[PDB]
Structure formats: C-alpha cells, structure tokens
C-alpha cells in the first residue's frame, strides 16, 4: 500500500516554509558569537555520573579544483595529505581522521605500492581512517541532478567497497551552498543511517539553536509516514574551521588550531595566537577549552558533542600532524583526569560521534524533533545571500544535463549485450562516469572555480560526451545488424551523434550535414534511440545538402518530412543589426520517429530530383523595416518581408500564441473557443552595487529590481510549416526563439552576454495570475517545493535554484517553466516568474575564489513552457509544502533531459541493417522511469548481473482517463534471468531476494533499484 504523497499534510515539528514565514531573520550583533548570543550553562550539569564526552575528529577539505584544477591540487597538497596521513595514523594508534574526496583517494590508492596499499587498508580496518560520505566528489545540493548525486555517490561507494571493503553509513557535507532534502532522500536508500550538514542561514541556525533542534529526523516534505526520515547534525556555527568548531568565540578557538603561530604562515585574525601547551599553562589552557565546549554543548541535547578539527587543505605537513596531535594529547590527558570538569575528551571519528548519540537516545537521554523542508537560500551573514551560483558558469551548467543524459544513453545501449575487453567498453563508460561525477563538485556545477580550472573541467566532460558517443555508436552498429554478418573494428564510427541542441546552432558549427546526390550517394539510414521506458513519438531534425529529401521507415512506408532554411544569426557589425542569414547549400529535415520503450528505430532519407510527395517546405517571413534578399539555394520558397508587425501561429490542433512586433509572446490560447490568455516574455537586467558589497560568482547583490532590455527595433524570422513553426528575434545579448510542434511551445535563447560587464540578463514572464506570493520550483529534478515570496528579505534571498523547472498557479489556472539547465530564479510579482540567462561580474565577493565573472560564453538555454488549466486537478491542501507536476509538463521536462538520440550513418552502405530493436519492450506507466540501467559485471564473469534505478514520480489526477500500460519487470528484460534482488540505490547491498524473479513496481515519489542475474 502506497503512501498518498498528495492528500496527508506530514505533522513535523518543523517545516522550513512554516518556520520561514514566522522567523523575523533580524541580523543582531550577539557578541563573541556574532549570530547568537552569549551561551550559559549550568556548572552542575555535568557531574561524576553524567559526564560530557567529547569527539574531536581531524578532517582535512579537499576541492577537487576550485582554485588550482584536481591535478594541480593532487599534486602540491593532497598526495602529501593523504602520504602524511598514512605515516602519521600508522604510527599514532590513538590519532584519528576522516576522508570525504574519493576522486582524490583513488588517484591516490593506485598510485601506491603494495606495501603501502596494505598498511592503508589496515588503518582503515582498524578505524582510524573512515571515510565519510565515499562519494567521488561532495556535490553542490543546489544545482544538481539527483541522478547525477547518485551516479557520483555510486562511483565513490563502489570504489571503496572494491579496494577499501568499506560502505559508509554516515555522510559529511560541511560545504555545499545550502542544502537539499535530496541528499537524505538519495541517502537513506543507500543504506546511510546519519547525516551532517554545515551551510545554512546564520537566521536559521539561531532559531534552531535556541530550541535545541540543531538534531533531527530530516523526512521529505509529503512524508506523511516518516520512512524517508535521516537522522541529521546541523553544525551551529559560521564556518567549518577550527575557530568556528571548538564553541561560540572564535578568538578562543583560533587559539586551539596550532597550525596558526607562524612558521605556517597563519595566524589568528581575532589577535591572540595559539600557544604550545605545556604543564605549566595546560591547567589554564583547558579551562579556557572545555568552557568553550560546554558552551556549544548546550545548543544539543545529549552528553556527546561533536567537535571537527580541520579546515581547507589542512593536514599537509608532518610538522603540522605533530603541532595538532601533540598538543591535543596533553590538553586530553590533563582534561580527562581533572575530575571537576567531569569531562571524557579523545580524537574520534564521525561514526563514532553518531553511535555515541544513539546510544544517549537509547538510553532514553534525548528525543529527537523531526523536520521538512531545505536549506536554501544560504546567507553566510548580513545580506549576503548566495543565490548568484545558481546561475554563474550557465554554458557548463547546460553542459552538465547533456552528459548526464549521454551517460545514461550509452550505460543502457551498451547495457543489452556483454562485452569483449578489446572494445573497451567498460573503460570509457567509467571515465564518462567519473568526470560528469568530478563536475558535481560544489565548485564545479556552481561555476565558482577559477577561470583555468572551469576550461579543465569543460574539457574533462568534451572527452566523457566523446567515450558516450563512441560506445552508443558501437552498441547502435550491434543492435541493428543481423549476428553473421556483424563485424566489429571497436575504433571505427560506424554513426556520428546528431545534437541538435549541444553546443547548440550559434554556439558551436558542429553538426554534419547529410550528403546527398545522384553523382555520389542517393540515400542515408539515420537510427533514433529511445531511452525512456514508454513509447514516444517526437519530431527530429537532421542537416541535409538538398531540399529535395523524403524519409521513408525500414518497411519503406512513406514519413511526412518538412523541410525548412538553415538560419543563422549575426551582430552584423557594419550595419549594426542583429539578422539572420539563411544557408544556400544546407537545409533542414524534420519529421515524427516512432521510436519502442528502451528501443530503436531506423529511417532512410533519400534523395530526389523535384519535390517530393510526402514532403512540404516551411514559408519564412523576415520582419523588419528596410529588408535586404535572403536567397536560399534551391530552397523551392521565397523569402517574404514586411514591416514589423504583431503576429499569430497554430501548429496543428495546439495552442495559438500571439507575438508582439518585437517577436516576444504575448498570449497563449489554448484550444479554438478559449481566451487569449496574457502570457508575455520580457528580457531585464540587474546591475552590481557601487557602494558596499559586490555580486561575484557566489553573491546575488543586485541594486535594485532589474530595469527593462532595451530593444529597438530588432529583426524578427517567421517559419512556418505544418509539422514545426516558430518566431525567432535577435536582441541584445540573446537570440530568443519559440518554437511550436503543436503542443507546449519550446523556447530557445542563444544568449551572449559578451562585454557587459556587471549585468546579469533575467528573461521574466508576466502573466495575469493570481499566485500572490507563491511559486514553486524543483530540488534536483527530483521533486516541487512550495516557496513564499518574503518581503522582509532582500530581493536575492527570494531568488531559488531552478535546476529543471518552476510554475506558479491560482484556482484554475498555471504556468509551467521546465529547463534543460539549471539556473537562478524566482516570482517576484504575482503572476511572474524569471529566470537568470547570465551574468558577468567583474569584482570578487570575497569567498575566496579572487576573480569576478568575466569568462562568458554562447550558450543555448532551453525551455518548455506549458500553460494549463487546472481547476479540475486533485491538488494538495493549502497547508502541504509540496507541489507536482502534470502530465504535460512532465513529458515537457523529459523532452528537454532526455530526448530522442539521433545517429547518421557514416559508411555509404549498411550490409545487414534492421529496422527497429525493443519493438517488445514494455511501454510502462508514464510516470515511472528507468534512471539507470547499467550492466554490472565484465565479459568474464559467469554469471551476468545488471542493475536498474527505477524512479517513479507523482503527476497530478485532472481527469484524464489516460490508461492502458504495462507492467515494466526490469528483471525479465534480459533473457535467462536466475535470479532478481531489490538493492541499496548504488546496487552494493543486496536488500530482498524476489519471488518469481519479478521486480515489483515502485510507489509514486519512490526510487528502487534491482539487479538481475542472468545464466546465460
Ligand atoms: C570485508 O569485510 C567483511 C565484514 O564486513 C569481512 O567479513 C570480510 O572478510 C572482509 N573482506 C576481506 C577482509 O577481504
Ligand atoms: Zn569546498
């Protein structure tokens, strides 16, 4: 029995939209502690009988590139870290660390010899080196795919469960900006029992502070039940570093990092330094730091009180383990037998601590609150909110969901057969893996890196997006040729990839055309590959030489195809207009493929000497004052001009949207007898401060709502067919398209901030409805969350991460935003909603990156904008923080993530080609998704296993009968299965042996994984 995610508002003790709405965020000087107050507590709290038992736990923060790249960094301070680490735990049974990084600890693993490998495996067996996590990275919340977070999570865990017999069941997350109640959610299923984050609003910490709720039982926010909840640590203070980390006064602690008396070239900014410890201060010494953690220790609610020891990079130098472990000894061994403090202090790990309060709990010492709800926007202090990363760096942004779909599209196509060692499968599947995972770095996705790490980074995912190629064009090649005549030379590219939106037209020249002619070649065979678990039919479009193509399927039946111009936009710098020009020798083809659940589907286009029967051609409308010709080849239409002017367009029985004269949308009707609903694009920007601080890559510190683009009088191209219309019109900074296929337009802005320094470009859309205050917006693709607007915070406080979509709604009428990339945005208005494009910032905001934001480049954001009635919609109850999608608008969003793959093939001829693979594929329910589908085991082994990540999300009921599916078994969809297994959602635990070896299907707003075994 499914819990219903819709109709139960969750009782919890906190819910962060409720706890929002009443908290009044005053930013008080509370003194030593800046954002608190001045801690008290009782002295006769502790005693001989209830003692305080402390755990410092030695941690070292390692960016995987930030402002030196991962190599850079491996080379001048982690192989040294992690080398010292090694020495100085080995001979130090007593001393303790933990590890996070996994990316850096396989890059140091297998550079060491046997010896060593064995003396590490041995510190970790014995405890003294845990990791925390085991991710590759520790991912940025905001931005990020939830199925990228487990992609990076599982290459992490699987590393270590290989080399190290290790699967941590606590998580580390002292870094990201604000997080995400995704990361308990992912967490949870993969068997992790607590948690620990550090970044959330100073406003925040203090309220939850103040009621000892700094510990809890974090369930997603349509939980009614509590299975989903995670037990989680919020640490109380500003930073992770040990001046923030021993209690509430920083220029007491800064004196208990020894690293800062000076040969390391630190020191305490609060102007007192550290000092040896010796017998004769120690007495002082301690008094001094047990108060301290007394102090942090009544912000909890057990006798155990975890206390980090670290910060960035630290644990370097041997001279450094010794200053830090040294002193510590003598301040723990005079602490511990001073029976008045009643105090237990030792070098511990994270697990450790959490055990410890589990066991408190037992004990019946402490119950725990629960809470819903996520951790942004993250203020750091006063106004400084960090809401500019949700957009700084939007081109890599845009980069990160197109691998995160080609990993996905080559780990299912190579998933079907088992492959020889030679084809090299295998290894270019986990490089694809491992640097889409490095990017999740929460100075990757962010785009809070320097500029010459950000180039290495984009170059990592250009070599990944070339292994997913070369292995889905390998497995296209064995899927669609007969057994005996398939040959294989597993260098050679039997298809190219055709993307028709990456890097995208404008950005990069990077598509092939399709040659064709009676003097050379008179046909192509193309082949779309379907990743989604359910049949679907979409319009694709491929460059061709000649306007005179028709397509035909595999059974040689006839595809209607339009053809349409190949336009291309220019700053033409001698007129200073903005225009396109059509090509004279390449055109486009479009038409519908019908492509099987998991499958593929052949065409063949071909060539002719006249127009053909089954193919029309687009009419296009150049609308400007002063028109120059825009011949087109043998493009069989002329060109039309006119004056600027407001226009209307219908693609067959969908909505008809109404433009300006400057071609932005201004209305959408969506059926015949329907209102012409005000829906209007307009583009804006936001300046930078001149007084006080300065946008940067992490900071949004506008100065002032945005002010209006000014437009002039800009060019804007018409085309008009019958399968795919659209208006495309070139402002300043964007070429803004909206196109129409005869449902929920797709909108497209190339955008090119170029040398407008201190701007960032906001595309809002300004509607009629009623939403007042509220707006929704994703976490990770994974679910909606209510946001209210709140006046009593800045503007960049209300702006929130769009990672794939945002809508706002009254009683009967919504507006749907989907993205292929994540970006900042928000409702500042009722009836808004905006989305930053990109901005270029030409200062630092002092969080340590030293540079601004003036690395610009083309990119091509994508959209699906759906309007919907939604009066008859079974919605949630005022009171429930979530909110879901509809169907239309999450086919819209798949659309945009996870599109057809397109493949030309590249040889003139195909000996043994076929037309279809999957054709008997289940074509499951539309709300359930195969994430994942990765064959598990090498050619080698015996007995096959291949694992699978259903994800089941929940659309709203609004009447529409919309039946008739099957039932998807993964674990039949490979022959001779002998055995089916539900496991953890990195598949490394093994959690229900299934009867029949049948998968059940998961509940709306769940995610399983299942991995079946195979005999032959
Ligand atoms: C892996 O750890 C388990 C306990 O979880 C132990 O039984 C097994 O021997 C370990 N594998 C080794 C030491 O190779
Ligand atoms: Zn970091």
Same mark, same amino acid.
């Given at each position: 029995?499914?819990?219903?995610?819709?109709?139960?508002?969750?009782?919890?003790?906190?819910?962060?939209? =409720?706890?929002?709405?009443?908290?009044?965020?005053?930013?008080?000087?509370?003194?030593?502690?800046?954002?608190?107050?001045?801690?008290?507590?009782?002295?006769?709290?502790?005693?001989?009988?209830?003692?305080?038992?402390?755990?410092?736990?030695?941690?070292?923060?390692?960016?995987?590139?930030?402002?030196?790249?991962?190599? =850079?960094?491996?080379?001048?301070?982690?192989?040294?870290?992690?080398?010292?680490?090694?020495?100085?735990?080995?001979?130090?049974? =007593?001393?303790?660390?933990?590890?996070? +990084?996994?990316?850096?600890?396989?890059?140091?693993?297998?550079?060491?010899?046997?010896?060593?490998?064995?003396?590490?495996?041995?510190?970790?067996?014995?405890?003294?080196?845990?990791?925390?996590?085991?991710?590759?990275?520790?991912?940025?919340?905001?931005?990020?795919?939830?199925?990228?977070?487990?992609?990076?999570?599982?290459?992490?865990?699987?590393?270590?469960?290989?080399?190290?017999?290790?699967?941590?069941?606590?998580?580390?997350?002292?870094?990201?900006?604000?997080?995400?109640?995704?990361?308990?959610?992912?967490?949870?299923?993969?068997?992790?029992?607590?948690?620990?984050?550090?970044?959330?609003?100073?406003?925040?910490?203090?309220?939850?502070?103040?009621?000892?709720?700094?510990?809890?039982?974090?369930?997603?926010?349509?939980?009614?039940?509590?299975?989903?909840?995670?037990?989680?640590?919020?640490?109380?203070?500003?930073?992770?570093?040990?001046?923030?980390?021993?209690?509430?006064?920083?220029?007491?602690?800064?004196?208990?990092?020894?690293?800062?008396?000076?040969?390391?070239?630190?020191?305490?900014?609060?102007?007192?330094?550290?000092?040896?410890?010796?017998?004769?201060?120690?007495?002082?010494?301690?008094?001094?730091?047990?108060?301290?953690?007394? !102090?942090?220790?009544?912000?909890?609610?057990?006798?155990?009180?975890?206390?980090?020891?670290?910060?960035?990079?630290?644990?370097?130098?041997?001279?450094?383990?010794?200053?830090?472990?040294?002193?510590?000894?003598?301040?723990?061994?005079?602490?511990?037998?001073?029976?008045?403090?009643?105090?237990?202090?030792?070098?511990?790990?994270?697990?450790?601590?959490?055990?410890?309060?589990?066991?408190?709990?037992?004990?019946?010492?402490?119950?725990?609150?629960?809470?819903?709800?996520?951790?942004?926007?993250?203020?750091?202090?006063?106004?400084?909110?960090?809401?500019?990363?949700?957009?700084?760096?939007?081109?890599?942004?845009?980069?990160?969901?197109?691998?995160?779909?080609?990993?996905?599209?080559?780990?299912?196509?190579?998933?079907?057969?088992?492959?020889?060692?030679?084809?090299?499968?295998?290894?270019?599947?986990?490089?694809?893996?491992?640097?889409?995972?490095?990017?999740?770095?929460?100075?990757?996705?962010?785009?809070?890196?320097?500029?010459?790490?950000?180039?290495?980074?984009?170059?990592?995912?250009?070599?990944?997006?070339?292994?997913?190629?070369?292995?889905?064009?390998?497995?296209?090649?064995?899927?669609?040729?007969?057994?005996?005549?398939?040959?294989?030379?597993?260098?050679?590219?039997?298809?190219?990839?055709?993307?028709?939106?990456?890097?995208?037209?404008?950005?990069?020249?990077?598509?092939?055309?399709?040659?064709?002619?009676?003097?050379?070649?008179?046909?192509?065979?193309?082949?779309?590959?379907?990743?989604?678990?359910?049949?679907?039919?979409?319009?694709?479009?491929?460059?061709?030489?000649?306007?005179?193509?028709?397509?035909?399927? %595999?059974?040689?039946?006839?595809?209607?195809?339009?053809?349409?111009?190949?336009?291309?936009?220019?700053?033409?710098?001698?007129?200073?207009?903005?225009?396109?020009?059509?090509?004279?020798?390449?055109?486009?083809?479009?038409?519908?493929?019908?492509?099987?659940?998991?499958?593929?589907?052949?065409?063949?286009?071909?060539?002719?000497?006249?127009?053909?029967?089954?193919?029309?051609?687009?009419?296009?409308?150049?609308?400007?004052?002063?028109?120059?010709?825009?011949?087109?080849?043998?493009?069989?239409?002329?060109?039309?001009?006119?004056?600027?002017?407001?226009?209307?367009?219908?693609?067959?029985?969908?909505?008809?949207?109404?433009?300006?004269?400057?071609?932005?949308? !201004?209305?959408?009707?969506?059926?015949?007898?329907?209102?012409?609903?005000?829906?209007?694009?307009?583009?804006? !920007?936001?300046?930078?401060?001149?007084?006080?601080?300065?946008?940067?890559?992490?900071?949004?510190?506008?100065?002032?709502?945005?002010?209006?683009?000014?437009?002039?009088?800009?060019?804007?191209?018409?085309?008009?067919?019958?399968?795919?219309?659209?208006?495309?019109?070139?402002?300043?900074?964007?070429?803004?398209?909206?196109?129409?296929?005869?449902?929920?337009?797709?909108?497209?802005?190339?955008?090119?901030?170029?040398?407008?320094?201190?701007?960032?470009?906001?595309?809002?859309?300004?509607?009629?409805?009623?939403?007042?205050?509220?707006?929704?917006?994703?976490?990770?693709?994974?679910?909606?969350?209510?946001?209210?607007?709140?006046?009593?915070?800045?503007?960049?406080?209300?702006?929130?991460?769009?990672?794939?979509?945002?809508?706002?709604?009254?009683?009967?009428?919504?507006?749907?935003?989907?993205?292929?990339?994540?970006?900042?945005?928000?409702?500042?208005?009722?009836?808004?909603?905006?989305?930053?494009?990109?901005?270029?910032?030409?200062?630092?905001? +002092?969080?340590?990156?030293?540079?601004?934001?003036?690395?610009?480049?083309?990119?091509?954001?994508?959209?699906?904008?759906?309007?919907?009635?939604?009066?008859?919609?079974?919605?949630?109850?005022?009171?429930?923080?979530?909110?879901?999608?509809?169907?239309?608008?999450?086919?819209?969003?798949?659309?945009? %993530?996870?599109?057809?793959?397109?493949?030309?093939?590249?040889?003139?001829?195909?000996?043994?080609?076929?037309?279809?693979?999957?054709?008997?594929?289940?074509?499951?329910?539309?709300?359930?998704?195969?994430?994942?589908?990765?064959?598990?085991?090498?050619?080698?082994?015996?007995?096959?296993?291949?694992?699978?990540?259903?994800?089941?999300?929940?659309?709203?009921?609004?009447?529409?009968? =919309?039946?008739?599916?099957?039932?998807?078994?993964?674990?039949?969809?490979?022959?001779?299965?002998?055995?089916? +297994?539900?496991?953890?959602?990195?598949?490394?635990?093994?959690? +229900?042996? %299934?009867?029949?070896?049948?998968?059940?299907?998961?509940?709306?707003?769940?995610?399983?994984?299942?991995?079946?075994?195979?005999?032959?």
């Amino acid at each position: 029995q499914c819990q219903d995610v819709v109709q139960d508002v969750p009782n919890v003790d906190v819910q962060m939209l =409720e706890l929002y709405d009443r908290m009044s965020f005053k930013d008080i000087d509370g003194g030593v502690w800046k954002q608190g107050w001045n801690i008290k507590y009782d002295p006769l709290k502790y005693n001989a009988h209830h003692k305080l038992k402390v755990f410092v736990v030695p941690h070292s923060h390692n960016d995987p590139g930030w402002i030196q790249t991962f190599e =850079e960094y491996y080379q001048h301070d982690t192989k040294h870290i992690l080398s010292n680490a090694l020495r100085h735990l080995h001979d130090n049974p =007593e001393m303790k660390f933990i590890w996070a +990084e996994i990316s850096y600890f396989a890059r140091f693993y297998h550079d060491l010899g046997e010896n060593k490998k064995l003396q590490m495996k041995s510190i970790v067996k014995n405890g003294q080196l845990e990791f925390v996590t085991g991710g590759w990275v520790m991912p940025d919340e905001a931005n990020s795919h939830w199925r990228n977070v487990l992609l990076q999570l599982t290459e992490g865990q699987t590393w270590l469960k290989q080399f190290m017999n290790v699967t941590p069941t606590a998580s580390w997350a002292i870094a990201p900006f604000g997080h995400s109640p995704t990361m308990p959610y992912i967490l949870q299923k993969s068997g992790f029992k607590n948690m620990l984050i550090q970044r959330t609003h100073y406003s925040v910490k203090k309220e939850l502070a103040q009621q000892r709720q700094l510990e809890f039982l974090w369930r997603q926010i349509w939980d009614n039940k509590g299975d989903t909840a995670l037990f989680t640590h919020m640490m109380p203070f500003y930073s992770y570093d040990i001046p923030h980390t021993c209690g509430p006064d920083p220029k007491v602690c800064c004196q208990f990092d020894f690293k800062r008396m000076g040969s390391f070239g630190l020191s305490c900014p609060w102007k007192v330094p550290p000092r040896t410890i010796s017998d004769q201060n120690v007495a002082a010494r301690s008094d001094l730091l047990v108060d301290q953690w007394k !102090k942090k220790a009544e912000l909890y609610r057990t006798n155990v009180l975890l206390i980090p020891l670290g910060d960035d990079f630290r644990f370097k130098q041997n001279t450094e383990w010794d200053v830090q472990r040294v002193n510590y000894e003598r301040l723990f061994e005079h602490i511990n037998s001073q029976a008045h403090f009643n105090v237990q202090a030792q070098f511990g790990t994270l697990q450790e601590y959490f055990d410890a309060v589990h066991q408190a709990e037992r004990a019946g010492q402490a119950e725990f609150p629960t809470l819903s709800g996520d951790f942004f926007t993250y203020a750091d202090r006063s106004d400084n909110y960090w809401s500019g990363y949700y957009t700084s760096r939007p081109y890599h942004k845009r980069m990160d969901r197109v691998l995160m779909h080609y990993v996905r599209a080559a780990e299912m196509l190579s998933a079907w057969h088992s492959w020889d060692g030679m084809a090299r499968i295998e290894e270019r599947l986990e490089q694809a893996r491992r640097e889409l995972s490095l990017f999740q770095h929460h100075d990757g996705i962010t785009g809070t890196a320097k500029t010459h790490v950000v180039v290495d980074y984009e170059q990592r995912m250009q070599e990944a997006l070339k292994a997913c190629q070369m292995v889905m064009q390998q497995s296209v090649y064995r899927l669609l040729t007969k057994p005996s005549i398939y040959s294989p030379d597993f260098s050679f590219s039997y298809f190219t990839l055709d993307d028709s939106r990456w890097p995208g037209s404008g950005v990069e020249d990077s598509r092939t055309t399709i040659i064709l002619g009676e003097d050379i070649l008179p046909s192509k065979h193309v082949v779309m590959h379907n990743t989604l678990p359910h049949w679907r039919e979409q319009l694709v479009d491929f460059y061709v030489s000649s306007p005179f193509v028709s397509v035909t399927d %595999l059974a040689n039946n006839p595809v209607e195809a339009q053809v349409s111009p190949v336009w291309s936009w220019h700053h033409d710098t001698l007129t200073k207009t903005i225009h396109p020009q059509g090509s004279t020798t390449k055109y486009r083809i479009i038409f519908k493929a019908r492509v099987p659940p998991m499958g593929l589907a052949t065409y063949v286009l071909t060539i002719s000497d006249s127009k053909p029967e089954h193919t029309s051609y687009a009419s296009n409308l150049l609308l400007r004052k002063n028109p120059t010709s825009l011949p087109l080849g043998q493009y069989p239409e002329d060109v039309k001009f006119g004056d600027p002017r407001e226009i209307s367009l219908r693609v067959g029985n969908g909505p008809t949207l109404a433009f300006s004269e400057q071609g932005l949308l !201004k209305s959408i009707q969506l059926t015949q007898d329907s209102p012409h609903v005000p829906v209007h694009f307009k583009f804006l !920007k936001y300046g930078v401060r001149s007084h006080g601080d300065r946008s940067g890559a992490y900071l949004f510190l506008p100065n002032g709502p945005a002010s209006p683009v000014e437009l002039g009088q800009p060019v804007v191209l018409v085309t008009k067919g019958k399968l795919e219309s659209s208006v495309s019109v070139g402002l300043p900074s964007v070429v803004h398209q909206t196109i129409m296929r005869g449902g929920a337009p797709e909108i497209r802005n190339l955008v090119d901030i170029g040398s407008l320094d201190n701007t960032e470009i906001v595309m809002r859309l300004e509607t009629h409805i009623d939403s007042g205050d509220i707006f929704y917006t994703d976490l990770n693709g994974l679910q909606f969350i209510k946001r209210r607007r709140l006046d009593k915070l800045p503007l960049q406080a209300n702006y929130y991460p769009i990672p794939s979509g945002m809508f706002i709604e009254d009683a009967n009428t919504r507006l749907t935003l989907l993205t292929g990339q994540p970006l900042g945005g928000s409702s500042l208005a009722s009836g808004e909603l905006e989305i930053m494009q990109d901005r270029r910032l030409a200062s630092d905001d +002092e969080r340590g990156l030293g540079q601004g934001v003036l690395d610009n480049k083309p990119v091509l954001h994508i959209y699906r904008l759906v309007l919907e009635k939604v009066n008859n919609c079974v919605r949630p109850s005022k009171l429930h923080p979530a909110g879901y999608l509809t169907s239309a608008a999450h086919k819209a969003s798949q659309s945009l %993530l996870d599109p057809l793959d397109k493949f030309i093939f590249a040889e003139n001829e195909w000996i043994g080609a076929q037309g279809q693979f999957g054709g008997d594929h289940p074509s499951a329910r539309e709300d359930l998704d195969v994430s994942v589908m990765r064959r598990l085991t090498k050619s080698s082994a015996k007995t096959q296993r291949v694992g699978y990540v259903l994800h089941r999300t929940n659309l709203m009921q609004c009447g529409t009968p =919309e039946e008739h599916t099957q039932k998807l078994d993964v674990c039949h969809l490979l022959p001779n299965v002998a055995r089916c +297994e539900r496991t953890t959602l990195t598949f490394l635990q093994n959690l +229900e042996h %299934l009867d029949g070896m049948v998968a059940p299907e998961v509940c709306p707003m769940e995610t399983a994984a299942y991995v079946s075994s195979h005999s032959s």
